[PDB]
Amino acid sequence: GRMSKFTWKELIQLGSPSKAYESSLACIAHIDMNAFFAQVEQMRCGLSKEDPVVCVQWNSIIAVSYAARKYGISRMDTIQEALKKCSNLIPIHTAVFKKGEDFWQYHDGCGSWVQDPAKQISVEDHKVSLEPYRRESRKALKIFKSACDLVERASIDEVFLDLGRICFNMLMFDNEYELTGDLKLKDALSNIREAFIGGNYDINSHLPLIPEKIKSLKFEGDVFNPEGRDLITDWDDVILALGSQVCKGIRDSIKDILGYTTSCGLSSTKNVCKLASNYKKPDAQTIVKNDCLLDFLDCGKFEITSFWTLGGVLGKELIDVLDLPHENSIKHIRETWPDNAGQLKEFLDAKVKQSDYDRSTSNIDPLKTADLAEKLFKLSRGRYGLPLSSRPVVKSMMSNKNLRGKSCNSIVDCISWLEVFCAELTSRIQDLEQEYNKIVIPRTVSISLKTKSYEVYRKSGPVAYKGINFQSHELLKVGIKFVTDLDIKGKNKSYYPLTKLSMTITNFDII
């Protein structure tokens, strides 16, 4: 065409962390450390990524390495079942707390699969610690925060990156990058760079057409192109290619410094990014161009239920409520309401109003349908761009134990368990303090139990600190007092042995 399909406004928008995600030109990444717990144990025990390791808790498998999966092992399997699929399996049990001890510890060469009765990790007196995974995640997150100025911690093993600044800055100012032996970005993109510093454009003006010398710019990773479309046809393509390069370097850092492999989804929107990181794994990168967004969504592997918020009960409700076919529901949503979000909105209002349609258990806000339609309209088209957003502050933290057998028959027994809970909540407060770079101190403690016959007892109250700071010993002390008060409360009633015991902290001052 004569001009690009994009404006200067939308390009310059890339350079503002608050608005960059709204640009059609946005370059978002979703990076997943797959089989995270297995990777962490592999690296700790000096093993390779091709070693069939399985992370184990009790008799179940919680993480399965991709090497282990070659043998048909899945989380579905027990350790005994997985060992009949691959006798060379390397099960590694999580760290555990022992009842009464204030620290966790690894019991290597111990597990329910080893014959020696000496080398067991009894479920009855032990509690699992996920601290080693928390810590490793923290190391990753610091390396991500180092390479990019807007990182969302989507979960323990997944982040989103907004690569707009980085990309926009490469595009305009990076005089070091070279496409070939003789070709450099500064020469190839001299026209866009001279126009931009010149300042003579109107922001709403369309961009200049991309130069031919940019078409040799290489994507890093696997560009999803079923229909064999051209790789670089406009500026959104240029930014994305740059992103993939930047994104590869970041992932190599994770591998170089910590040894973890990742999958990466690169695209304009967060939901499309997450689909792509999962599309091939492990150690892979998938780029989804804007012009392939419909090729990607329609490939066959996705349905309306594949999206972040639609994976569960609300997802089903929509299939029902929108009479969507059990295949190509996304496409089906595009064509039925082809022109605008509102068409979906009115339909919803009509279905919204029906005798069969519940109002009581409905996961659908009647007031909030305006947005629900726009979400779906745009999600169906791969243009639903949310901002990268910090997770809100914690309100509650809990550490409990499901007790079986008669281990818990006394106040003394309960107190041994509280020690483990305190130990654990202390290390979790610490993870939080680093995440926030702020002191976190809880003012309220709650002690909960379930009796022999599954009745619930509970006691909340303040915890006081002799110092300005938080001290685990003051949390325990209050816990002990509550546990003791509940003992008296249950004297000639159904009580021991307990079947469940827990500690919860709330009312944090993030001073």
Place this chain on the structure above:
DNA sequence: GTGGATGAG
């Protein structure tokens, strides 16, 4: 006040 429902996979 909170048991139960809910999200991912």
Place this chain on the structure above:
DNA sequence: GCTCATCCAC
């Protein structure tokens, strides 16, 4: 299957 934090009809 499980997890744990978070939300809200009861």
